[PDB]
Symmetry: C3
């Protein structure tokens, strides 16, 4: 699965992305639907943005979990809530001290137009 994050760089230090990944990876693997050698978490920092009217110090974090097609809505609905909870908890200190917007979405890769070649599965398995 692909866990992609976009984060305004005004919160880059405090967001602690390494620490969220450190938690996210294992949490998804633990569900048993997702293989740990397949989990790929990364962030794209943003230096130029405009949230709302740009009149305050606004910060945002947008997250996408792209997964293989086939899991049931129910199974996705539940891994989502579970992961949203973890995310919420990771950013709680921040949400209480500054203006912050959190958004998380789950999408599926194309059922057949999907290609992969990954040698780390060998390490695990």
């Amino acid at each position: 699965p692909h866990f992609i994050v976009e984060c305004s760089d005004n919160i880059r230090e405090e967001a602690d992305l390494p620490g969220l990944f450190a938690k996210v990876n294992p949490t998804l693997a633990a569900t048993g639907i997702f293989p740990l050698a397949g989990i790929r978490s990364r962030v794209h920092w943003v230096d130029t943005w405009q949230m709302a009217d740009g009149q305050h110090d606004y910060a945002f974090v947008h997250m996408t979990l792209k997964i293989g097609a086939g899991r049931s809505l129910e199974s996705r609905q539940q891994a989502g809530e579970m992961l949203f909870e973890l995310i919420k908890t990771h950013f709680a200190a921040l949400m209480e001290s500054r203006l912050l917007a959190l958004s998380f979405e789950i999408e599926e890769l194309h059922p057949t137009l999907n290609f992969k070649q990954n040698n780390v599965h060998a390490l695990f398995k």
Copy 2:
């Protein structure tokens, strides 16, 4: 909504993204469809790219607007058209003096696997 821009860094200065965001944010909100507190506009700069044949000084801007599921196709169509007119107008002096490709598409976020926590609503509302 999420207004996500990808821009080649050869026009990073002349493109004036901050200036585009200053006009897009208020035009989305005035449509009466998107709450100001929810608009997050951002650019991701690209330093390595190849357009066509890589034979000239090509520049490009790719824009995606991701919105919540549920607006009627006709709403979305008329909003995309009025936004595109503003965009073109914004880039008109560049379209005039150099090689530029503008592309814009509107995408819906998944209808139920969409999670959020935004405290800036409390400021507007």
Copy 3:
């Protein structure tokens, strides 16, 4: 079409993205389905990520081809295979030598909510 890559920067020079793009652009064009003036290839470098367990020096390359809607699944399939064959070949040497994960998916743009303005078609034509 849009060929978007996300690359972990631990293989930033070894990956030779300019080299992959140099091959990718002409092979999309040689199909007769994708106009040269229209192919935009670019990479988003990632400086913060976690693959798997974060235990070793893992690298990952994720690629998305986004094309306008309406092509048969069968053409998309043959363009997908043909191009995964060339990606595999481009990184075969890194693969032999290190932990690496290659992923590639083909996605379509909305059939109608797509807007564009490109003055480079003029050079072609």
